Symmetry: D6
Subunit: 112 residues, 12 copies
């Protein structure tokens, strides 16, 4: 994960479960992006970014860069932290996104 | 899986769970196809088609050919990717279809 | 299973889970049959009848004979295939019925 | 189980799970019996009574005697079969009742 | 459990799971007690009190004393039996209460 | 019904009439071993609790054999011994099941 | 009730009155072995925590035997020893269960 | 269909026509061991209960082999022996599966 | 846990699962805090604070200090106990909060 | 509270104040074996992560014993050793639990 | 796609193009043991059933090795042997995975 | 972030920056055994798949050790060896975790 917040700037352990959903029946006049839901859930331990992600989650801070190499592979736009579980004997950060790219390279709802 | 997109053309690991449902009570004036839901879920690893399927899923790209040999057996029409889970220690691609053929050979809602 | 379709005629591996439900409170003016739901779910492998059952399921083809010996025991009327899951390392065919007979011999909503 | 139907007369393997529920808040003007739900679920194999219970279930036949010794202990009134699952490698018959007696001896909504 | 019914008087095996819930958002004009739900579930075998609790459950009989020592610790007011599961190879009696005391000693919605 | 149950001392009066049948046979028979000694038959009965409970529980600890064991639904079992009770699992030798309708009976290691 | 519990030193005062009963007997009795030594009786009690908790937890570590063990519901147990506590599983020898109504009692390996 | 089932004494009449197929082969073959002896084939059939139940249950205890074993869906099995029945798991040697459409058949350890 | 009630003052075993949720779509005119839900669930045994937390839960007593060191790390404002499960062979206290701080140090909806 | 935790070198400063208690005693005591050596006490603590995490994780690998171990809720433990941590399971010898109210304490294998 | 699959006799025609990849390496390598012999690679493929099913099932019983094994998504596998099929789990030696985009390939125990 | 990962030949370029940490220590240390040899440390990383996948999968089969292993969240690990990958479980010796805020680090079996 290379991650940078709108506010907190750059934030410094292998996530990750990528979930994407699209209804078979598209609402009349609805954009595919609005009908779809993209969510990637990252699991990792707890350290210096934990308070940074937890602040972003409560303040609705946008991720300025969200790039997952798996220079990378997954790149996500309009990233918003939507859920987090911190616990003990790990945390699980669930992100919501709009545009995405996987690298043949695929991309949808991307923005220049 | 022999697969080809409307847009991406031909896309290059053993799925697969075929689910089909039909309500016992058919709505007055409703076609059996509209009441039914056909879904096949394919599990496979992750490689050159992964970004291709993931782009199709976000762009609502129609599969032009969807043929599962199991020259084949399962052939599906109006194929639309409706869901996908990519994760680690695989992905799971869930397709929605209208017409279908299994090969005695059976076929319903097929189109020339 | 000795099975014959309305259309496909006779169709050629030990199912089976029989489920039947009846509400304690019967709606005013409602027939017991309409309040009840009879469902038998058969699990078996996949072969020459698989496409035949899968076609019946999509075309809403009525089973003309549905007799389960367990010359038999279970016999079912107005049989309609309502669900099917085909998968790998089997299929599961879920039938809906009205009249039934088990053989003391019991029978309800049967028709000559 | 000593059991006798309204219609089938006397019917000839250790059930049994007794479930009874009562809401803490009783509806204004509602009798405790109407708010409550008594259900006993009997599991047993499959034999001469199986078609008899299965006929009762579809025909809404009232049990004339329902006495479970565990000369007995559990005795139930207004017994109606509400659910049944027959299956293989057993059946499970779920009864609904009004009045009941367990034997100190307890009894509620009983009738002479 | 030292227990005495409103009606059955005194009733003669280590429960017990105490559950209490309170919504974070309190309805305007609502008392905390009415928003909350207190439930203690006792598991024990089956014997002379079994028919006594089962009668109380069907007759909505109030427990006059409900004291759980764990001279005791848990004491509960306005105790009403709300659920019970009797079964075999135990019963589970689920009580609902208003006032409570645990013994530092805590107490809420108690009454002299 | 449930079970008609008589005991080889003593006595038999558990209230009448009062399940999961398991039978195993190794695929390879030990050289010189009779199938009966190689096989294992156990029927597990579920029920609530009363007058038979202490009678079953005394039998289990005293290694008291049954003398009649028939659970009609008809099953009949020989050399029945209680091997486990969570408050009932019986172990048997000879066995007979007989269906209805038909009068077909299967039986093995039965004794004159 | 719960348990009336006295201890063989020391003492007995855990507040009165304060479960899953398991008993096992191997189908084949070791040659020359008494059933009591071959069998295993354990009753597992669930409860909250107070004045008896340290008393139970001290007994478990000190291998302190009980002297009265009766959990009335009536069960009575001899040579009761605490073998496991996740904050309670007792192991016993002799046992008696007695039902109500009736006055029927089963008992094995009881001692004068 | 279900199964056409004939038995090597006696007899064959379980009502016709009446599943999970498992086959295992260790990756490393024991030196001097034939694959057939190293492998294990078992097909587990689920079904309700009737005229074949006592016939299957008698066969299982008597170590009665089958002589025809074909479950058409076509599967055919040799040296079929019932090894387990929870009221059916068969163990086999030779096997053949044949698909439709096509006429393709796979077969191993089959016998003339 | 260093904890102090509004009323009970200071209250005297390693929780803890921190859950925080934020909807991707923020209601028009809604503050992020009102859309979000912060919940931390602490598991611990049962002792002198148990009645104190249980009283707070029923009386809707505000925690004046809620500081979890893991001088600390987690600090929570407007803490309200919303749920509790006390049981046996532990309790689980579920808190709801507004402002929070984890220590880089993150903080949201905090108040001087 | 959580835990007050001091360590036998070094040091003790994990921020204060910072669970599932398991204790087992075999029913049969090995001849000549002291109960303490036969028994096993382990308390499993769940918590998030901070300044104590590296301190706990260093202790676990260095086989560093604790010198104060008290988790107040009061539990006190001797010879405390960390045996497992999934990012905490401690193993102990002597133990004391003390309830409130009352001042009742149980204790075993405690040391002067 | 699925798999392109050729077999070392005979033959290869299972319809093209037709999963969970597991690889294990003990942390401590046996003295004098090559990693390949110490490791275990198995890929489990899920799919429906047709013309390849009898071909896979014949291969599994005949210990028929594959000669081409490539599942493109690209995976390529050597010494592929079917070890288990519930109606497919393959065991392999050499392996290659190659990603897209990039042209990066990892490979071990591959053979010229 | 994820992981910064360098390898001891060859090479290191899996795209940067790219989990469940388990550590076990037996309560009783084998006589003459160093804690490090008695303990077992494994961190399990979950992630999607790309350029590092073949690099991780080649390393696992070739018993290729890592030379930098740091997963920042900061964890640092020595003698890191891949032991299992379902398409990642690493085994390590020395370890360091360092929290933020604070600058507190725990470390064991680290090497100069």
């Amino acid at each position: 994960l290379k991650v940078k917040g709108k506010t907190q700037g750059e934030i410094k352990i292998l996530a990750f479960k990528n979930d994407y959903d699209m209804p078979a029946r598209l609402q009349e006049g609805l954009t595919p992006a609005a009908a779809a839901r993209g969510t990637i859930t990252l699991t990792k331990e707890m350290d210096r970014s934990s308070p940074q992600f937890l602040q972003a989650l409560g303040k609705r801070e946008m991720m300025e860069e969200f790039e997952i190499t798996i220079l990378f592979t997954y790149k996500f736009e309009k990233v918003l932290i939507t859920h987090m579980d911190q616990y003990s004997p790990i945390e699980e950060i669930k992100f919501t996104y709009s545009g995405y790219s996987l690298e043949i390279a695929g991309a949808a709802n991307w923005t220049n």
